[PDB]
Structure formats: C-alpha cells, structure tokens
Homo-oligomer: 340 residues x 3
Amino acid sequence: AEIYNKDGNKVDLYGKAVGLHYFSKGNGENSYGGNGDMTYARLGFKGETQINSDLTGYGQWEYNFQGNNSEGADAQTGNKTCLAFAGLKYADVGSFDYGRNYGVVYDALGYTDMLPEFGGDTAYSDDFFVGRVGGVATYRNSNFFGLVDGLNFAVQYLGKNERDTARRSNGDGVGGSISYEYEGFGIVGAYGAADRTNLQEAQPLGNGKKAEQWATGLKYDANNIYLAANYGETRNATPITNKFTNTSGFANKTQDVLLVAQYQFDFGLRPSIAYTKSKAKDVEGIGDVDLVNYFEVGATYYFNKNMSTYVDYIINQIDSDNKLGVGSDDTVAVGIVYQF
Amino acid sequence: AEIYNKDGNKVDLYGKAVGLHYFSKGNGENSYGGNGDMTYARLGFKGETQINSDLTGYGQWEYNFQGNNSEGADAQTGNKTCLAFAGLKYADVGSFDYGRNYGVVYDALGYTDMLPEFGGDTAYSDDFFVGRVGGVATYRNSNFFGLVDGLNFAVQYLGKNERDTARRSNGDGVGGSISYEYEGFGIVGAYGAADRTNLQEAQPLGNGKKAEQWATGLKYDANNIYLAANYGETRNATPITNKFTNTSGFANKTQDVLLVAQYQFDFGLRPSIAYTKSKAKDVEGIGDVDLVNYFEVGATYYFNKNMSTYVDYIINQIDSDNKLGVGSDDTVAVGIVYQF
Amino acid sequence: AEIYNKDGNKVDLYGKAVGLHYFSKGNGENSYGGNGDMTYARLGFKGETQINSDLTGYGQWEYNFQGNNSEGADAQTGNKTCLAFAGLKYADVGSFDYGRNYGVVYDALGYTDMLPEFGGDTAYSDDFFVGRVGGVATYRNSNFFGLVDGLNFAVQYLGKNERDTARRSNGDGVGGSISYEYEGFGIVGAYGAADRTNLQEAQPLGNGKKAEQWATGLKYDANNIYLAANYGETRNATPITNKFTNTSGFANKTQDVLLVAQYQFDFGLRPSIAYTKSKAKDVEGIGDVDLVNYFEVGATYYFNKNMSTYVDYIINQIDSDNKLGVGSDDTVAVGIVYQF
C-alpha cells in the first residue's frame, strides 16, 4: 500500500498474512509438498524517487516471517530476506541495480510460476541464475533504447558467493536474456554460465567446473486467458539428493518442461491447470531419474485486490520406485490470503 | 496507527518500544521474574477490507524483537512471530480465521491477564488451548446469529503440531467457549481437549494420551472499575520442570485461581491488586506442589494513549522449600512504554 | 518518512536498502574490510508524542537485515536490533530514556564517524560506553537548564550485562559527557568507567577489574566544511584477538586518534579525507601493537535526500608484520543507497 508520496518520493509498504495448510497422506515425507500448517507472512517495501525527469532511483526489501513455528527455539525456522537491492533507471538508457535479486534465467521461468500455491519447481533459491541469489548486478534495457517497442534485454553479473554449503554457493558468472512482446504474445530466451566453487566440486553428485542454465518461454496473455510454456536445460546446476544414500550434489544434466493454462472469470474465480516435469540425466549411479513430475488442478477466488482463497491440488506422477527417493504422494493446499 | 485507508482497505501499522528492567535479589535465579534489562519492541499490522456490506476480510501479524540481546551471536534470542492469521467475517453468520492465534480457553483467561507487567501465569505459549498456538482454525459467533444480544460462542480446531520438543508440541483437538455479557458483567466458560504426541508421552512427568484444559471467568467492567476472577483446571497439559532432577513433562492435574482488581483514575493512574495461585496435583514423585503463588501490587500511569510507565511488584508467596525448585524471591518491574 | 501525524503523535517509519560490495585482494582475510557482497537493509521507527506543552514522550527501534546471506541455514547471520528505547523530555529540565542505545563516550566519537562506508573504528558495539549497548539509562540536559546556550551534558548509568561471551558482557558503570557548541565550533569531553565481569576477567589478554574509556573531540561544522578530530584512550576495554594464538581479551591500554575533513559541494559531491590510528599498549606478550592504522579517501554523491552512491577507499598503513595478525591489505567499497 502506498503509505508515502511527497517531494517525488513514494514509499510502498506492503505485506500479507497467509493462513495456509497442506494435506498429504502419511507424515507427508513421501508426498509432494509435505503436510500440515504452513502459515506465513511477508513484509517489504518498494521505494522510488524522481531525481529529475529522466533519472529515477529505487530500492526494495522483502522479508519472510514463518507463521508455523513455536515461540520456542525453532521460532526463526524459515525466516529470511527474499530481496534487498537499490538501483537507478535512466531515461531510455536502461536500469541498473545491485543486491539480492532474481537471476536472469527467471526472466524466462517467471512465465509458468503462476500456480496458486505450487509450481515454479525449477526456479530454486541460491541456485545460480534461476531464482533469488545474492550479489547480482543487473542491467536491463527496455524497448531497445526506445528504438524498438517490445524488445527488451538484460545482462547480469553474478559475484562469487562462497557459503558454508555447496548448495547455497556459487563462483562468478554472467547471464543474459532477450524477450519480445507483441500484443498479448511474449517470447523469451535466457542463459547464464558460472564457476562452481571448490566445495560444490567436492560433492559426490555432478561433474564439471562450470554451471549452465538456459530456458526459453512462450506465452499468450490477454482476454482473461493465460497460457504459458517453458523449456529449459541445465548442466551441473540443479541440486539433487539421494535419499537412500543421503548423498547430494548437482544433476549433471536436466531437461525441464512447464505448461500452464488459466482463465480469469469476471466474478473472481481463476481456475488453473498445469503440468511440470523435470528429469535428471546421467546422475552418477542412477542414470536418468525424474525429479519433478505431476499435473496440477487448482483454483483461486479473489474477493477483491486484498483478499483471496485457493486450493491447489498436485496429482503427483512420480512413481514409488523413483531411484532418488523423490516423494510420490499427492498434496492439497488450502489457503486464505490477506494482503496490502 | 492507521497508516492506510482507501478503497475499503484500512491498514493499521502498530508497534511499541518498551524500556524495561527487573529487580530481584541474587542472580534472579530464585526470584519470580528474574533480574536485569528486559527491554523489547513490537511491530505488527492489522488489515481489514470490506469486500461488500456483509463480508469483511482481515489479517494480522505481530512480531517480538528482543531489545536486551547483543549484536553478537545471541542477537535473535527471544525473537518470534506472536500472531499470523487471515480470516473472513460474514454478516451475522460469524467469523472464521486460520493461522497462529489464541487458543479458545484464553477467551476465559483473558479476563485476568491485565497486570502491568506480570500476571496471566497460566496462559502459556504453544501449550494447547491456553495461549498462542500454531495452526488453529477458529469460528466465532456474536450475539447468537444476531438473535441474542450479548451471547457469543466459538469452536476451535487445533491441528497436530509435531515439533522437536515435547513442550512445544500437540496432537489434534477441539475446543469451544461460550460467554455472555450483560451491562458491565461478563461470564465465560471455555474448554478444549487434544491428543498428546508420542514425544509428550515419552516424557518423565505426566500420564495420559489426552490433554484437557477448561476455565471459567467472571468480571465486572464499568465505571472505571475492573474486577475479574478466573478458575480453571487442567490434565496433563501444564508444562513443569523438576529443577533438582532436571526432569520435565506436564502436571497430571492443576487447579488455577486468578483474581484482579483495578481502578482507573481520571488523571491517568491505574492501580492494580491481584492474586494468583496455581497448584499441581499428583506430580509423579512430589505429590502436590505450587507452581505459582503470589500477590501483586502495581500501578500504571498513562500520560496519554501513546505513552505510559509502570511498576509491577510481585510478593511471591512460594516458599523456599518448594519441591520443584520454583523460585521464592520477589521481583519488581519498572517500564516505560512508547507505542503507536 | 513521517507516515503518521495526528493528535500530537507523529510516527516516522524509516529504512534503507543498501546494495554494497567490498573489493580486497585475496580472500579478504588479510585486508582491512574483507571482500565481496555486503548488501543490507534497515527498518526502524521513531515516535514522538506531545503529552502537553512541556512534556514529550518518544521511542525508537531500528533493525538490521543482512542482504548477503542465503535463504538457507545462514539466513539470519548479522541480523540484529541496533536500538530500542523509550523516554520522556521535559521542558528545560532534560530528557531521560532507557533501553539499547549509544553509550555516552560516543557523544565524543560521533564527531569522526562520518566516512562514507568505513571510519568510526573505535566505536565498538557491546563494548561499554563507546557504541551501542543494552540496558543504559541516559539523562541529557541541553543549554544548561536553558540558562546557558550551547552548553549540554549527560550522565549515563550502565546496568550489568552478563552474556555468554566476555566480548559482549559488562558490569555496572557510570559515564558522562560535557560538550559546548559555539557557532560552527563544537568541543566535547566524555568519560565512563565500569565493572568487568568474572568472565571478562577470566580472559587471557588484559588485566584489571574496571574498564575505562574517555575521548575528547573538536569540530568545525559550517560553510559546507566539516573538519573533526578525536583523541581518546582506554584501559582494559578494547577487544583484541591474537590471530596466531587465537587468544582474546582486551587491550590493557590504547590511544586513539581520528581526523576527518570533508566538503559538501553544492552539486551533491561530498569528498572525504580521513586518518585513523589506534594502538594498543602493554598487550600481554606483544608489547605495543597497532590495531587500526590507515588513510581514507572516498566520496559520496547525493542525487537527492533519498538516493546516493559512494566509493570508500582504505589505504591501510598496518604492516604485514603486525604482531596480532591484524590485516594489512587495502579495501574499496562501492555502494548504492536508497532510503526513506
């Protein structure tokens, strides 16, 4: 909600309180999304100041407060800063920002990350260019310097992040994306390559000294209709765990497909149908193994712009004999969202 | 403070900075409330949107930021989300909300939780239905569907919470409350029963497979006078620790009494007199043992609605030979509160 | 940004998102400030209510959210409450506040804590009276009860803080400061002494049962010019670590000097030149050893009151043969700040 706007500076303080619950049989250990209370809340700010006609500065921070922990020792479980960056936009020259933000490849995966509760399975966090990462400098150009309506691109420089964990670490890398949007249609290509750290390399699964990820996307967004499709692949970048051996590392190779179809009724009901499948290839020891594979049926109902509720149903296609131990049960999510 | 209100959506951003200090002799280990700096702050939001004349959506999140930790390793000690839920209210049909909220039995104990700094000893956190708990779905009806002025009730469904700790865990359960308020008078009955988890059962103290708690309350609230009284009992629900043996679990049985009397002077001074006593019965090994037993004398002075200060004095009646090791010394709290 | 102001209560919600990066050769282990992403954000509130013409209540809380952590286990690294206190100001009698706040000696060191990114090396946290500490009651008088324009003083009572760490602990103590400001000129004297805890005393480095710190400051602040100088000393108060032996404790004695010179161009560029040197004396085993020693060249450019960017360059004068293992390499910080 825009709580401030004077002297060319507008601050938008936003947040949401999400009562959420997952239903999966068993202890949800073998299900797709787990089971039980998953209530959480968000608080963030978006600032933007007009330094003059052509120049605009801006910043953004968003935090995630888990609402399903006790007031005991576990209170902070899952709490984190999702985004934190500052930047400048200049006329038709482009924008530049630095901090914790979205890797460029997500310019592609963003297409199908529209399910009510699940979806976007491939957009992992602290996983190079696919989701939110720390220390990224991103330059974005829109309408090709104002010369070509609808043609945008971006280049991104990822700074090395040597964390205590191979999963949350990365070496230096560069990525870019080019997208074009013409009247309801949108197409995108995104790609990035980076150095893997010593620790990532010391891992049991995955072999290389460079991590790659690229995805293409296609969408039709108009007339209350939303259809979107993504296809991407990766090399030594996707994190995987052998539940049997308790081994971990990265998939040597993966091929990922994501399809989504939705319709927004004028009365507020937005049904959703989706399909996701991500399969790993050449996993040292297993061979080919599915990591994600399901159908999604779900719906969201918007009471207005501040209140909504939804049910998300995952019809897990993963089979019980999956070699990595990936869960095979279904999961149903019911949620009620207040937001401002 | 209501920082936003447009298009039927009002957001109230609230908070407080509490400079606080406890005075108890010794290392406060044997005193009632401990000793030293207890400064803290709160930040939360309350949102409410009018979806139409009869239907209102709302949400709320409140966080506790300890102000007595260092900027070192201990910085987060005591930090937690107190509340986090979203819900809908419909005409005279009732309200429904889900998330981390107050168990129904607190509809009763709320009566005497009015002391300046202490009090409300029996309203424990993550302790079934008495205080704040996670994953509760609560339905509330007011004025009996609009047919009976002053007659309200609630039913609450507690979802199983299997935490790493027996103290912060719970199985499924249901609770309800009925209250009636007629001109300054208010009376309430609240009750809830739930399943105890494997871990709670694996504990040394307390024996059963079901946890119960019920409390009744009576109050006179008018003419600057506030008198309130609670009486409740519990079975295998109250957490207790043998300080000698370092054993823990739940009291097989407890009988709890709470009395409070206060007066609000027109100039801002609100003196307080209270009495609390909670005794455990059949504790495996000890027999009967008091857990809480004191008199309270204290006062609050309101400079206005945003600023206040108070002194809370606990005249601990617990004796030095208390079998569980419960402290016997007094404690004095002085605080200065700014809030918005 | 003042987001609220009605009925004599104004709330100022403020914050900033800082995209930040350090450049130092090697793994920054041997450099002055380290190396890599240092992005962070702040959120805080400042409230002030007019209880009547002479009496004002107020409160303040400020939090630090690191933006360079992952969403994994390390998410909370560096997160902390910087300030949290409430207080009252009365006519010309003075103000009083309690909570986590700035020790009195910082009334002096504040003079030279003006560098773009570094500087203020001696103003440590949870280190008695020099930086932010918990549980301090502070009385401040301005203009000597209104009788002497420009003559102010303060007295501060530090409550014992017995933490799990010798570095973040302290016993009781008192401190004061007197400053005088006449037309662009400002001079200050600050001093405080306190008890060291058992644990601080059980440390390998530093010998005494009392901690002292005093600093004087002098400044010329006018006509776009800012020159400031500090000199202070300490006994058993400055925390130091022998990187070789991995030993720790406090410097028996230190002499600290800080000089700063800056100029604010009308177009927004504020160049900075500074010099800092802190040397420890009588360190058990080493003798005399520099702890901090460098020149600083840096600049900040203000686009407006909400947006800025800067480069801070430390020309480390510490030499590679420094006995404690203090780093000798340079560090360069580049940052882009959005704030409201």
